[PDB]
Amino acid sequence: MIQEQTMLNVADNSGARRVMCIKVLGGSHRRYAGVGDIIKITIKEAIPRGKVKKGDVLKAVVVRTKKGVRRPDGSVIRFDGNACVLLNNNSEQPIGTRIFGPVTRELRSEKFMKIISLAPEV
Amino acid sequence: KIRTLQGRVVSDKMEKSIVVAIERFVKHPIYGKFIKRTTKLHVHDENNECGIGDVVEIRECRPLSKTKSWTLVRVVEKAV
Amino acid sequence: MVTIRLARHGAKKRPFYQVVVADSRNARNGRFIERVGFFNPIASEKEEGTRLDLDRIAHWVGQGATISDRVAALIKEVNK
Amino acid sequence: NIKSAKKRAIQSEKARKHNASRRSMMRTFIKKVYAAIEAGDKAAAQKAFNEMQPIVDRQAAKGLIHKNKAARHKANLTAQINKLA
RNA sequence: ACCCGCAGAAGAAGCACCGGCUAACUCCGUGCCAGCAGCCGCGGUAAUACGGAGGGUGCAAGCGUUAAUCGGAAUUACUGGGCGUAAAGCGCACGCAGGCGGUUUGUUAAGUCAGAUGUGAAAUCCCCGGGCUCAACCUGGGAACUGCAUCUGAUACUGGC
RNA sequence: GGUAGCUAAUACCGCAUAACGUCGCAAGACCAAAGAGGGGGACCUUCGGGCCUCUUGCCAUCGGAUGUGCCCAGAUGGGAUUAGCUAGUAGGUGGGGUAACGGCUCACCUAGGCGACGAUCCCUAGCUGGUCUGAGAGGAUGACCAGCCACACUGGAACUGAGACACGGUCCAGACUCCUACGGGAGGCAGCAGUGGGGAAUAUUGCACAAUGGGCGCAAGCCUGAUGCAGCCAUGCCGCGU
Numbered sequence A: 001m002i003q004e005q006t007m008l009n010v011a012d013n014s015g016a017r018r019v020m021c022i023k024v025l026g027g028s029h030r031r032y033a034g035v036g037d038i039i040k041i042t043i044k045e046a047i048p049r050g051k052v053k054k055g056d057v058l059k060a061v062v063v064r065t066k067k068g069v070r071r072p073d074g075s076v077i078r079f080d081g082n083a084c085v086l087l088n089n090n091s092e093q094p095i096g097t098r099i100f101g102p103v104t105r106e107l108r109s110e111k112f113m114k115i116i117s118l119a120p121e122v
Numbered sequence B: 001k002i003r004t005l006q007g008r009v010v011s012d013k014m015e016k017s018i019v020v021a022i023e024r025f026v027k028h029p030i031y032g033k034f035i036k037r038t039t040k041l042h043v044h045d046e047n048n049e050c051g052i053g054d055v056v057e058i059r060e061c062r063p064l065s066k067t068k069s070w071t072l073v074r075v076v077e078k079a080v
Numbered sequence C: 001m002v003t004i005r006l007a008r009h010g011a012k013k014r015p016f017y018q019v020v021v022a023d024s025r026n027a028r029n030g031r032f033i034e035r036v037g038f039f040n041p042i043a044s045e046k047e048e049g050t051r052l053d054l055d056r057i058a059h060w061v062g063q064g065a066t067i068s069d070r071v072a073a074l075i076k077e078v079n080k
Numbered sequence D: 001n002i003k004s005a006k007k008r009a010i011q012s013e014k015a016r017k018h019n020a021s022r023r024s025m026m027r028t029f030i031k032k033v034y035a036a037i038e039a040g041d042k043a044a045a046q047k048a049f050n051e052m053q054p055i056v057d058r059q060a061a062k063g064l065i066h067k068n069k070a071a072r073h074k075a076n077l078t079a080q081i082n083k084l085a
Numbered sequence E: 001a002c003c004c005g006c007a008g009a010a011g012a013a014g015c016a017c018c019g020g021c022u023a024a025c026u027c028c029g030u031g032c033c034a035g036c037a038g039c040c041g042c043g044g045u046a047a048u049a050c051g052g053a054g055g056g057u058g059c060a061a062g063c064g065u066u067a068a069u070c071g072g073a074a075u076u077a078c079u080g081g082g083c084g085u086a087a088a089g090c091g092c093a094c095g096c097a098g099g100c101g102g103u104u105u106g107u108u109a110a111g112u113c114a115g116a117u118g119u120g121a122a123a124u125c126c127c128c129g130g131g132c133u134c135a136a137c138c139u140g141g142g143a144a145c146u147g148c149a150u151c152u153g154a155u156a157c158u159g160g161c
Numbered sequence F: 001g002g003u004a005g006c007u008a009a010u011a012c013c014g015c016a017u018a019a020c021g022u023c024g025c026a027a028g029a030c031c032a033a034a035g036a037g038g039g040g041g042a043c044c045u046u047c048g049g050g051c052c053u054c055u056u057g058c059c060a061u062c063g064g065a066u067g068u069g070c071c072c073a074g075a076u077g078g079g080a081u082u083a084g085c086u087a088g089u090a091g092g093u094g095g096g097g098u099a100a101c102g103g104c105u106c107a108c109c110u111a112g113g114c115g116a117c118g119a120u121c122c123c124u125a126g127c128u129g130g131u132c133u134g135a136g137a138g139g140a141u142g143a144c145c146a147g148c149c150a151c152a153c154u155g156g157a158a159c160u161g162a163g164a165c166a167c168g169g170u171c172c173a174g175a176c177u178c179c180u181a182c183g184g185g186a187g188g189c190a191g192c193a194g195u196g197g198g199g200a201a202u203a204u205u206g207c208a209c210a211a212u213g214g215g216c217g218c219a220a221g222c223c224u225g226a227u228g229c230a231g232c233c234a235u236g237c238c239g240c241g242u
Helices: C054-060 D004-019 D021-037 D042-049 D053-060 D069-082
Strands: A006-010 A019-023 A038-043 A057-064 A083-087 B005-014 B017-022 B039-044 B055-065 B068-075 C002-007 C018-023 C034-038
Touching: A038 A083, B017 B055, B017 B068, B039 B055, C034 C054, D004 D021, D021 D042, D021 D053, D021 D069, D042 D069, D053 D069
Parallel strands: A006 A083, B039 B068
Antiparallel strands: A006 A019, A019 A038, A038 A057, A057 A083, B005 B017, B005 B055, B017 B039, B055 B068, C002 C018, C018 C034
């Protein structure tokens, strides 16, 4: 499960295999992150085709978990990687032009549908 | 008749092939001195009668193999 | 098809035209077998204007290359 | 409008299911003729080669192997039955 | 296109340069300041060097400034460089692989010289016939492109034997 | 645009016939396909053809004409403070492959092959007709132009056809732009033109199937940002005003 000091691959286009989870947020004491809810990330490698800097502090949201999406019936829909997508801290919204993720029901429960819907996978 | 060139054998170390050196002897285009511009060719030889120091006469086909288009006509000096 | 045809030649508002034998196949005025004449649509109303090698064309037609309506009518300008 | 080149891969794969299938049949026919030389000799080989002869010409009549390979196959095997003693 | 008329000096001129080399130059103001300069160098009370002014010089629908290429440039040197010092000759001995080598004969023909047949695309130079005055351009006929290959002589020199 | 029911061939396959082709000294066996159109009389009918006539096609064999595939030779940017380099590199044995060649592509035996005439490796790069310069030699350089070789957003495979190693194609993938109120979907201006960006900088989303060519059609005719012409600029050259 995703938590503080976890290294992940990123769902943002031209993002590197390595970004670091520095805070799990929620204001109260928190163990692990949650799908469709925010997390604090630092960029540990930057790709020159991408739009981010190494060592920069950013806002993100969790978009796929090895724990799967499973609330309504207990029937799990599962993925073979843990990943988040990057959000702007003032203007809001996913900062990329493509997302590498399943873009499930709880991501369309956010204000983001216009920039995630190019490829629905479930 | 046919066109043939003269040379000397520089390697025989290959089962059905030999290597021959030929001298085209050409004038330098600016400074006018004549230069050998010696060229080493691989030559087809199934009869295998030659060795280091033999003077030979050769002809072109047809490409016989990769980097080989010449074949042996006659042995010229038949010395030693 | 080897054809006897008119080739693109002239100036802005002043076309001149040449006639050549070529397989087509080949592109515009290039890579032709031989030239046989020139048209000049004006020809300055003179007998030293417009020329056609009617005897070499006679050896290139038969039993030879094709000649279409507009090119078979060049003989009518030299008349002949 | 059209671009008939967009039809030619489909027209080739639909035909491949016979036009390449017969290449496998023809590769096999060489085996049937060499198997008739061990069945064997002059009283089996030239009788069995005459099962292959018309099929090679009947394929060449449609194109595909017409430029040399069809006549090449017939000549190659005519020379192999002529070699018999 | 071309022809005929209506039209009135009417609508039409620049930019650089002038101490010595270097064409044309004097006076004002500034007073080592400001503003200049291809090199020699300008400016403190005559500035022919700045800015202006009056007169000249140059080219012209152009005139001028630059980072640069060719000329001047034989100062990159083949046509056609240089090594005592001015800048380069190794402190010295021997020598493989390279370059070079007397002379009488024959022979090979790589190389040279001679003669042909193919080819060296079309534009195009140059000669020259048309088309617009000249010409750019479209061309009609010529020429050259010393080349290269394939056949064939000379048989002298060089390499080879 | 997918599927199913239905129906015909100048769409398709067999059964026939078949040359100087196949292979051989040779007799000889074998492989194929389409009619159509305009005109037109006697005889006959259910008078949307029996039948005559010319044209043009269809299937095959073998030559010319012209290309396409292949390998060489002479010509050829820099670097030696790169001196050694290499394992399909270098030779043989056997298959397969192509219209055809070769290691061309494989599997195995052999260890040679290439170097101071610079191998090996690395940087730079459309080439030549041409262009400018000066008396020329020589130098600096190859826009446009004619021809030739390569390229089609970035990349692989090659297929069709007479031909592409396919600007306006296939299977798509990558980087993407655009559409979707959200269930998957179209495409590649280094064509013709504008525009965002890059730059000290290079012209208009001009007019027209009028002429010409190519393409289909037996021909009338239809298609054509091919092409043919405008528009703008001291940017170079030439004749000429004020």
